[PDB]
Amino acid sequence: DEITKKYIKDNIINVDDNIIKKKDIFKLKNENNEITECAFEYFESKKKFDDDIESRFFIINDNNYNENINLIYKDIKYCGLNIQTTGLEVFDENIRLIQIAVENYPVIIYDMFNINKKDILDGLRKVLENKNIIKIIQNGKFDAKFLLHNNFKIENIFDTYIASKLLDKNKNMYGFKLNNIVEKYLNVILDKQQQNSVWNNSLLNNNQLFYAARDSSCLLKLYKKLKEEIKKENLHIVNDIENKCILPICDMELNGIKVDLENLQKSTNEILNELNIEKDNLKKKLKDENINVNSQQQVLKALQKNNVRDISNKLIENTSDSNLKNFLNHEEIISLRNYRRLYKLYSAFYLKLPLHINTKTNKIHTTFNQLKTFSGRFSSEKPNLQQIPRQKNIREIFIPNDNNIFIIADFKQIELKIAAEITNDEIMLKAYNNNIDLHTLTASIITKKNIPDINKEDRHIAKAINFGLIYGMNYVNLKNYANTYYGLNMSLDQCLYFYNSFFEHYKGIYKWHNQVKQKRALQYSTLSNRKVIFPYFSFTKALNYPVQGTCADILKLALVDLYDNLKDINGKIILCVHDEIIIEVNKKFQEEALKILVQSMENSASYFLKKVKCEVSVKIAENWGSK
DNA sequence: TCAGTCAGCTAGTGCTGAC
DNA sequence: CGTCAGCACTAGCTGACTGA
Ligand SMILES: Nc1nc2c(ncn2[C@H]2C[C@H](O)[C@@H](COP(=O)(O)OP(=O)(O)OP(=O)(O)O)O2)c(=O)[nH]1
Q1: Which residues form a coiled coil (predicted)?
Q2: Candidates A378, A411, A415, A418: which one to mutate for ligand 1, based on the most atoms within 8 Å of Cβ?
């Protein structure tokens, strides 16, 4: 059929005869500021749409290039940018199309599969390189990952998902794809009926491109509305920080963290042997063999028939650790707890990690998200790096490149500093400008001891009590809290004494507590002005939201500043989990990387917490788990 | 030729736990 | 502390193998 090959020369199979070629005169501006009546060919669909979204476009091929096309990108303040790929596995997938949508002009499609010369790209490369150009991208992490992975460098992004989900105040956790965003904000219906059609083939149907163009173009009107809205609520600082934080996260995904196959294999063997001996020990102790050990009901029944009793002689009703913590006396319970520890460690780490190692590079790559978390903290998906255990320094398996060295850092008591800033408390500022940790003050005032006499146990108690009641935790609940992360034994009178003693001097904390509990606002706001509207009031989460949101914001700003500064020595950002950032630099640059990291994080802290200076616990380590 | 099971799949609790 | 994961496990639901 000649109909299906109407524009086969442009690598567009005419599956549906609903198209038309057309070449118009364009009054583009010359480099000498002279209007030139050039002309390029653009394709249109015979069937229009009720929407005002642009539908024309150009396809730039190896043999459809005209050098004057680059003038369309000249002297421009913003451009949309949509990227479509063959799949989802970035390390082994090729970018399919690069979309650019200039205002009052058709979308420009770079048919990458049909591009073999450099001249077409360098204009687009320069267009991406400019720092006075804003890029509108849907879920900018995706497109940025693919761009940097195929030798591109973006230097300004205004992702629509970031701004929208910041605006939504976490009212809803779903319905934020492109169609939902346009539906909500614009009065348009994109009709995303494309069910992921085939893309790997060079030849692509016409309707497929026509849909692919709309998503690129509609980001422009979306930007026009979203800037006005987001500026209206004074959310420009949070938007700017979050959006400048789209490059470093992408670099962290691309670089990954190396896994030591030799050490991992060794540890798997040793833990397997230990698990075998422990399992045999438990099975012999349980006096039975039919009982599959891992199950909870059957092992509970085994304990019950073993006549296992508590201090009050009652039979054990459950095997919860908080319950098993009460019966450490019995011999079988110790073995059971040990077995469950080893099996949890085994299944959680040593069988999970091998599934998530890119053998082509011997590395583990996360999928970080920056707005999924309630407080805006990061949240590692697929391989959850946060769920890797701290125990034993199991991080020995993770080591840097064969000629590189890690640099580890972390904020020291960021939550307390943020709380002091928000409450404007006098005593915390006094202690901090006195170069004294708040933990020492809490321990002293609890024990009424001299400052030099604060032992490590008192420091632990101070940390526990401070973190317990900084977020408004009922003093009766402290009894259970003690045997939840500190294993401490506490009495109601002692709990009350600590409770009263804290607010007896931490006046600003008490003022903050009373105001939060009294107002019962639905909408809360951070120091970065990040906002959230709860379904109702929740006192603990209410107090928790501002300080932890500010923590996420300060960490993101630090990441942005570190990324910008590290370009001098060409380093790599590898991971950020819990107020802790690790970078990786080859040798001969470590004494400079230390300065870069410390100065960057210090500047980031000085931005937000004006009253209190922050202190960084930096270090240098051959392995992530170094002491 | 179609009732009546049993052999796989699925929802859900439920406990369990460590970050 | 709430937010994930990992388990079995318990039960229920459903099409293939008898049953004549
Ligand atoms: N909910 C909760 N989060 C924890 C706990 N331990 C650590 N985290 C996570 C989330 C917290 O925001 C953050 C607190 O970090 P830490 O205070 O344990 O570390 P840091 O070295 O800053 O301790 P410091 O206060 O300086 O003694 O880490 C815990 O027991 N409970």
Answers
A1: 261-306
A2: A415
